[PDB]
Amino acid sequence: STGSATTTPIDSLDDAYITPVQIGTPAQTLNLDFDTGSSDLWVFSSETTASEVDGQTIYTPSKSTTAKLLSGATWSISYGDGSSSSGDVYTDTVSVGGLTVTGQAVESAKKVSSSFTEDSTIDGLLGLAFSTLNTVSPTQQKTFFDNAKASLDSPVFTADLGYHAPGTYNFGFIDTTAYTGSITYTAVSTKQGFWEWTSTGYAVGSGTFKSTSIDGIADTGTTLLYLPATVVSAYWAQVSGAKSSSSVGGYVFPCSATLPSFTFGVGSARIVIPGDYIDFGPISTGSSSCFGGIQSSAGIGINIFGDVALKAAFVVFNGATTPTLGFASK
């Protein structure tokens, strides 16, 4: 089997992408944030504290004839940005782009943190990291991809995120029309539960490529590109007037600047992030200070190849017995 679904930016900055997901019988369609950095499929629901719902579409398990309470199961998650959510668990039928999993754990939110409430466009998350990170207790549950894998034509999914435009998540096949050149595959460590890999280096604009190993994760659920402070300093040094602002929380730059590209290495191949992709716009409405899309990971503990990087590529998440990642230009 295969599936194919369009993913759409939630706003004009590509802060996140939403993909429609059918849950239950009859289908209830929710727009979920597909997140290769986590492993829970959780939704706003009829059980969510009413004051914490503000415009999201909700899953109502009592209206699904295929929903079954997973007795005794609870979940609770905290994300790298400080947000969180928790609740109980149903199993139900879940379909993405024509690909159907029966008995998928659907984690129903009883509580969500304010950042989720405040974002009316995101109805939940669909985790695509490794199932060892799933938070369901006392019986850990499998991700949608893990449940679907055996049925797929090939045990893979691909992320093709657009710049200021829709893109595509495919399951079970490589669309060879969706990229240019070849796909370069690189080794993955699953020891932390992430799609963790080692980039071979970087370049700033037209500058020389610096060969250096940069371990990080491919994370569709993180907006920006988070890299070591040395690398980030070298990038922003090429932008007149750019500086790290402790009060804003990262590098800012004059909105009148033209940003240089940033290149990262995948083996001997190179992915070029155009400068435009690094502009996240005014820090507040009407400001002439703009927020940068490349930021230091020094306070995180891990480097993160988020959407800024991933949307410059066609990315293959190969879930074979020994997983690998693939990157191609597009």
CSV table of C-alpha atoms in Angstrom, one decimal:
chain,number,residue,atom,x,y,z
A,1,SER,CA,0.0,0.0,0.0
A,2,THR,CA,0.9,3.7,-0.2
A,3,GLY,CA,-0.4,7.1,0.9
A,4,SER,CA,0.1,10.6,-0.3
A,5,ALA,CA,-1.1,13.8,1.4
A,6,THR,CA,-0.6,17.5,0.8
A,7,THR,CA,0.9,19.5,3.7
A,8,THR,CA,0.1,23.2,3.9
A,9,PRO,CA,1.9,26.1,5.8
A,10,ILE,CA,-0.2,27.4,8.6
A,11,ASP,CA,0.8,31.0,8.0
A,12,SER,CA,2.8,33.3,5.7
A,13,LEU,CA,6.1,32.5,7.5
A,14,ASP,CA,5.9,28.7,7.2
A,15,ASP,CA,5.9,28.5,11.0
A,16,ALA,CA,4.5,24.9,10.8
A,17,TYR,CA,2.7,22.7,8.3
A,18,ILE,CA,-0.6,20.9,8.6
A,19,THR,CA,-1.8,17.7,6.9
A,20,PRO,CA,-5.4,16.4,6.9
A,21,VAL,CA,-5.9,13.1,8.7
A,22,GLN,CA,-9.0,11.0,8.8
A,23,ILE,CA,-9.8,9.5,12.3
A,24,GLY,CA,-12.7,7.2,13.1
A,25,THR,CA,-15.9,5.9,11.4
A,26,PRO,CA,-17.4,8.0,9.9
A,27,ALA,CA,-14.2,9.9,9.3
A,28,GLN,CA,-13.4,13.0,11.4
A,29,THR,CA,-10.8,15.0,9.5
A,30,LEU,CA,-8.3,16.9,11.7
A,31,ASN,CA,-5.3,18.9,10.5
A,32,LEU,CA,-2.3,17.6,12.3
A,33,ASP,CA,1.4,18.7,12.5
A,34,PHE,CA,3.5,15.8,11.3
A,35,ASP,CA,6.5,15.8,13.6
A,36,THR,CA,9.6,13.6,12.9
A,37,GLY,CA,10.9,14.7,16.3
A,38,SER,CA,8.3,13.1,18.4
A,39,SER,CA,6.3,9.8,18.6
A,40,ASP,CA,2.8,10.5,19.9
A,41,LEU,CA,-0.3,11.0,17.7
A,42,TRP,CA,-2.4,13.3,19.9
A,43,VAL,CA,-5.5,15.4,19.1
A,44,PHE,CA,-7.7,18.1,20.5
A,45,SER,CA,-10.9,16.3,21.5
A,46,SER,CA,-14.3,16.4,23.1
A,47,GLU,CA,-12.4,15.6,26.3
A,48,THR,CA,-10.1,18.7,26.1
A,49,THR,CA,-10.8,21.3,28.9
A,50,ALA,CA,-13.2,23.7,27.2
A,51,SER,CA,-11.3,26.9,28.1
A,52,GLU,CA,-8.2,25.4,26.3
A,53,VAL,CA,-9.9,24.9,22.9
A,54,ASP,CA,-10.0,28.1,20.8
A,55,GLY,CA,-11.0,27.2,17.2
A,56,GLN,CA,-9.4,23.8,16.7
A,57,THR,CA,-11.4,20.9,15.2
A,58,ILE,CA,-11.9,18.2,17.8
A,59,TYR,CA,-12.0,14.4,17.7
A,60,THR,CA,-15.1,13.0,19.4
A,61,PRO,CA,-14.5,9.3,20.1
A,62,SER,CA,-18.1,8.7,21.1
A,63,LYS,CA,-19.2,9.5,17.5
A,64,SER,CA,-16.8,6.9,16.0
A,65,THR,CA,-18.1,3.4,15.8
A,66,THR,CA,-14.5,2.0,15.6
A,67,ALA,CA,-13.1,3.9,18.6
A,68,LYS,CA,-12.2,1.9,21.7
A,69,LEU,CA,-10.9,3.2,25.0
A,70,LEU,CA,-7.4,1.8,25.7
A,71,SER,CA,-8.2,1.0,29.3
A,72,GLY,CA,-5.8,2.5,31.8
A,73,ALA,CA,-3.6,4.2,29.3
A,74,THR,CA,-2.5,7.8,29.8
A,75,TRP,CA,0.0,10.1,28.1
A,76,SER,CA,1.9,13.3,28.9
A,77,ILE,CA,4.5,15.1,26.7
A,78,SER,CA,6.7,18.1,26.9
A,79,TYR,CA,8.3,19.5,23.8
A,80,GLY,CA,11.6,21.2,23.2
A,81,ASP,CA,9.9,24.6,23.0
A,82,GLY,CA,8.4,24.3,26.5
A,83,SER,CA,4.8,23.3,25.4
A,84,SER,CA,3.0,20.2,26.7
A,85,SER,CA,-0.2,18.2,26.6
A,86,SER,CA,-1.7,15.1,28.3
A,87,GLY,CA,-4.7,12.9,28.4
A,88,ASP,CA,-6.1,9.4,27.8
A,89,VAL,CA,-6.0,7.0,24.8
A,90,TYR,CA,-8.3,5.4,22.3
A,91,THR,CA,-7.6,3.1,19.4
A,92,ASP,CA,-9.3,3.9,16.1
A,93,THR,CA,-8.9,3.8,12.4
A,94,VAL,CA,-6.5,6.5,11.1
A,95,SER,CA,-6.0,7.2,7.4
A,96,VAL,CA,-3.4,9.6,5.8
A,97,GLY,CA,-3.7,10.3,2.1
A,98,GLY,CA,-5.4,7.0,1.4
A,99,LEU,CA,-3.2,4.8,3.6
A,100,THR,CA,-5.2,3.2,6.5
A,101,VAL,CA,-4.1,1.9,9.8
A,102,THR,CA,-6.6,0.1,12.1
A,103,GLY,CA,-6.0,0.0,15.8
A,104,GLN,CA,-3.9,3.2,15.9
A,105,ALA,CA,-3.4,4.7,19.3
A,106,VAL,CA,-5.1,8.1,19.2
A,107,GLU,CA,-4.1,10.1,22.3
A,108,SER,CA,-7.0,12.3,23.3
A,109,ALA,CA,-6.0,15.6,25.0
A,110,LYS,CA,-7.5,16.4,28.4
A,111,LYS,CA,-5.1,19.3,28.8
A,112,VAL,CA,-2.9,21.3,26.4
A,113,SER,CA,-0.5,24.2,27.1
A,114,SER,CA,-1.3,27.8,26.1
A,115,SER,CA,0.8,27.7,22.9
A,116,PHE,CA,-1.4,25.0,21.5
A,117,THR,CA,-4.7,26.7,22.5
A,118,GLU,CA,-3.4,29.9,20.9
A,119,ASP,CA,-2.8,28.2,17.5
A,120,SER,CA,-6.2,27.6,16.1
A,121,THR,CA,-4.8,26.0,12.9
A,122,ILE,CA,-3.2,22.9,14.5
A,123,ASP,CA,-5.6,20.2,15.7
A,124,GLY,CA,-2.9,17.9,17.1
A,125,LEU,CA,0.4,16.2,16.2
A,126,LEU,CA,1.3,13.0,14.3
A,127,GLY,CA,4.7,11.8,15.5
A,128,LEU,CA,7.1,10.2,13.1
A,129,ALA,CA,10.2,9.6,15.3
A,130,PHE,CA,10.9,6.2,16.7
A,131,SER,CA,8.3,4.5,18.8
A,132,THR,CA,10.7,4.2,21.7
A,133,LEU,CA,9.9,7.9,22.4
A,134,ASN,CA,6.1,7.3,22.7
A,135,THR,CA,4.8,8.5,26.0
A,136,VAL,CA,1.8,6.2,26.5
A,137,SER,CA,1.9,4.5,29.9
A,138,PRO,CA,1.8,1.7,31.1
A,139,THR,CA,2.0,0.2,27.6
A,140,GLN,CA,4.0,2.2,25.0
A,141,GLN,CA,2.2,2.5,21.7
A,142,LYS,CA,3.5,2.5,18.1
A,143,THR,CA,3.6,5.4,15.7
A,144,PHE,CA,1.4,5.6,12.6
A,145,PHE,CA,4.4,4.8,10.4
A,146,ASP,CA,5.4,1.9,12.6
A,147,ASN,CA,1.9,0.4,12.4
A,148,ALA,CA,1.7,0.9,8.6
A,149,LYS,CA,5.3,-0.2,7.8
A,150,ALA,CA,4.7,-3.9,7.1
A,151,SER,CA,1.9,-3.1,4.7
A,152,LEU,CA,3.7,-0.4,2.7
A,153,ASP,CA,5.2,-1.2,-0.7
A,154,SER,CA,8.6,0.1,0.7
A,155,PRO,CA,9.2,0.9,4.5
A,156,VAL,CA,9.7,4.6,3.9
A,157,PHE,CA,8.1,8.0,4.1
A,158,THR,CA,9.2,11.2,2.4
A,159,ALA,CA,8.9,14.9,3.4
A,160,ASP,CA,8.7,17.5,0.6
A,161,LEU,CA,8.0,20.7,2.4
A,162,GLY,CA,7.3,23.9,0.4
A,163,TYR,CA,8.7,27.4,0.8
A,164,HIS,CA,5.7,29.6,1.2
A,165,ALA,CA,3.7,26.9,-0.6
A,166,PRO,CA,2.1,23.5,0.0
A,167,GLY,CA,4.2,20.3,-0.2
A,168,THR,CA,3.7,16.6,0.2
A,169,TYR,CA,4.2,13.7,2.6
A,170,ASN,CA,4.3,10.3,0.9
A,171,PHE,CA,4.2,6.9,2.6
A,172,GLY,CA,5.5,3.7,1.0
A,173,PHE,CA,7.1,5.0,-2.2
A,174,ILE,CA,9.7,7.4,-3.6
A,175,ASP,CA,8.3,9.9,-6.1
A,176,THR,CA,11.2,10.1,-8.5
A,177,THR,CA,9.6,13.2,-10.2
A,178,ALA,CA,9.8,15.2,-7.0
A,179,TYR,CA,13.5,15.9,-6.8
A,180,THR,CA,16.5,16.7,-9.1
A,181,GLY,CA,19.7,14.8,-9.3
A,182,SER,CA,20.2,11.8,-7.0
A,183,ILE,CA,19.3,11.1,-3.4
A,184,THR,CA,22.3,10.9,-1.0
A,185,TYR,CA,21.7,8.5,1.9
A,186,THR,CA,23.4,8.9,5.2
A,187,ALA,CA,23.6,6.8,8.4
A,188,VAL,CA,21.1,7.3,11.3
A,189,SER,CA,21.5,6.6,15.0
A,190,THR,CA,18.3,5.7,16.8
A,191,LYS,CA,19.9,5.7,20.2
A,192,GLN,CA,18.0,8.8,21.3
A,193,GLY,CA,14.8,7.9,19.4
A,194,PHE,CA,15.3,10.5,16.7
A,195,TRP,CA,16.3,10.6,13.0
A,196,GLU,CA,19.8,11.5,14.1
A,197,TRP,CA,22.5,11.9,11.5
A,198,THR,CA,25.8,13.7,10.9
A,199,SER,CA,26.1,16.5,8.4
A,200,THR,CA,29.6,16.8,6.8
A,201,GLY,CA,29.8,20.6,7.0
A,202,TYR,CA,28.6,23.9,5.8
A,203,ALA,CA,29.1,27.0,3.7
A,204,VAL,CA,27.9,30.6,4.1
A,205,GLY,CA,26.8,32.2,0.8
A,206,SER,CA,29.4,31.8,-1.9
A,207,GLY,CA,32.1,31.1,0.7
A,208,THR,CA,34.3,28.0,1.0
A,209,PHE,CA,32.8,24.8,2.3
A,210,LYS,CA,34.0,23.9,5.9
A,211,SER,CA,34.3,20.2,6.4
A,212,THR,CA,33.2,19.4,10.0
A,213,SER,CA,30.9,16.8,11.5
A,214,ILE,CA,27.6,18.3,12.8
A,215,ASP,CA,25.4,15.7,14.6
A,216,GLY,CA,21.7,16.6,14.6
A,217,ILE,CA,18.2,15.5,14.0
A,218,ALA,CA,15.8,15.8,11.1
A,219,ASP,CA,12.8,17.4,12.7
A,220,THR,CA,9.8,18.4,10.7
A,221,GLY,CA,8.1,19.7,13.9
A,222,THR,CA,10.7,22.4,14.5
A,223,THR,CA,10.5,25.6,12.5
A,224,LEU,CA,14.1,26.8,12.4
A,225,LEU,CA,17.6,25.5,11.9
A,226,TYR,CA,19.5,25.2,15.2
A,227,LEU,CA,23.3,24.7,14.9
A,228,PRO,CA,26.4,25.2,17.0
A,229,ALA,CA,27.2,28.8,18.1
A,230,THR,CA,30.4,28.9,16.0
A,231,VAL,CA,28.5,28.0,12.8
A,232,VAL,CA,25.6,30.5,13.5
A,233,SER,CA,28.1,33.3,14.3
A,234,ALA,CA,29.8,32.7,11.0
A,235,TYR,CA,26.5,32.9,9.2
A,236,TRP,CA,25.2,36.1,10.8
A,237,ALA,CA,28.6,37.8,10.5
A,238,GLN,CA,27.9,38.1,6.8
A,239,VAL,CA,24.7,40.1,7.4
A,240,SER,CA,25.4,43.8,8.2
A,241,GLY,CA,23.7,44.8,11.4
A,242,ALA,CA,22.8,41.3,12.5
A,243,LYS,CA,23.3,40.6,16.2
A,244,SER,CA,22.3,38.2,18.9
A,245,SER,CA,19.6,39.8,21.1
A,246,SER,CA,19.2,38.3,24.6
A,247,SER,CA,15.9,40.2,25.0
A,248,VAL,CA,14.4,38.9,21.7
A,249,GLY,CA,15.9,35.4,22.2
A,250,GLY,CA,18.2,34.9,19.3
A,251,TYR,CA,19.8,36.5,16.2
A,252,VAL,CA,17.9,39.4,14.6
A,253,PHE,CA,18.8,41.4,11.5
A,254,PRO,CA,17.7,44.5,9.7
A,255,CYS,CA,14.6,43.8,7.6
A,256,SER,CA,16.3,45.8,4.8
A,257,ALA,CA,19.1,43.2,4.5
A,258,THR,CA,19.5,40.6,1.7
A,259,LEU,CA,20.4,37.3,3.4
A,260,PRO,CA,23.0,34.9,2.1
A,261,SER,CA,22.3,31.3,1.4
A,262,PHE,CA,23.4,28.5,3.8
A,263,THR,CA,24.7,25.2,2.5
A,264,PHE,CA,24.9,22.0,4.5
A,265,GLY,CA,26.6,18.8,3.6
A,266,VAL,CA,25.1,15.3,3.3
A,267,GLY,CA,28.0,13.0,2.6
A,268,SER,CA,29.7,14.5,-0.5
A,269,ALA,CA,26.4,16.2,-1.6
A,270,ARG,CA,25.3,19.7,-0.7
A,271,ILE,CA,21.9,21.1,0.1
A,272,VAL,CA,21.5,24.9,-0.5
A,273,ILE,CA,19.1,26.9,1.7
A,274,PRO,CA,18.3,30.1,-0.2
A,275,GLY,CA,18.7,33.3,1.9
A,276,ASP,CA,15.0,34.1,1.6
A,277,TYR,CA,14.2,30.9,3.6
A,278,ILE,CA,16.1,32.3,6.6
A,279,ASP,CA,13.9,35.4,6.9
A,280,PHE,CA,11.2,35.0,9.6
A,281,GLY,CA,10.0,38.6,9.4
A,282,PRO,CA,9.5,41.4,11.9
A,283,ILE,CA,10.0,40.5,15.6
A,284,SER,CA,6.7,42.4,16.3
A,285,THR,CA,4.3,44.0,13.9
A,286,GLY,CA,5.8,47.1,12.2
A,287,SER,CA,9.3,46.5,13.5
A,288,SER,CA,12.3,46.9,11.2
A,289,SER,CA,14.1,44.2,13.2
A,290,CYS,CA,13.6,40.7,11.7
A,291,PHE,CA,14.0,37.3,13.3
A,292,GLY,CA,16.6,34.9,11.8
A,293,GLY,CA,15.9,31.4,10.7
A,294,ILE,CA,19.3,30.0,11.8
A,295,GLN,CA,19.8,30.1,15.5
A,296,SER,CA,22.2,28.6,18.1
A,297,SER,CA,21.6,25.2,19.6
A,298,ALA,CA,23.9,25.9,22.5
A,299,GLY,CA,20.9,26.0,25.0
A,300,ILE,CA,19.2,22.9,23.5
A,301,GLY,CA,21.7,20.1,23.8
A,302,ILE,CA,21.2,18.9,20.3
A,303,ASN,CA,21.4,20.4,16.8
A,304,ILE,CA,18.1,20.5,14.9
A,305,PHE,CA,17.6,20.4,11.1
A,306,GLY,CA,14.1,21.9,11.3
A,307,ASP,CA,11.9,23.1,8.5
A,308,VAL,CA,14.2,25.9,7.3
A,309,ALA,CA,16.7,23.1,6.3
A,310,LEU,CA,14.3,20.4,5.3
A,311,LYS,CA,12.2,22.4,3.0
A,312,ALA,CA,15.3,23.0,0.8
A,313,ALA,CA,15.3,19.2,0.2
A,314,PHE,CA,13.4,16.2,-0.7
A,315,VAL,CA,13.9,14.0,2.4
A,316,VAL,CA,13.6,10.2,2.6
A,317,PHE,CA,13.0,8.7,6.1
A,318,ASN,CA,14.0,5.1,5.4
A,319,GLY,CA,12.6,2.8,8.1
A,320,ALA,CA,14.3,-0.4,7.0
A,321,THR,CA,15.8,-2.7,9.6
A,322,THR,CA,18.8,-0.3,9.7
A,323,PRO,CA,17.2,3.1,9.2
A,324,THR,CA,18.9,5.7,7.0
A,325,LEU,CA,18.0,9.3,5.8
A,326,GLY,CA,18.2,10.5,2.2
A,327,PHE,CA,18.5,14.0,0.9
A,328,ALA,CA,18.1,15.3,-2.6
A,329,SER,CA,17.9,18.8,-4.1
A,330,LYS,CA,14.6,19.8,-5.7
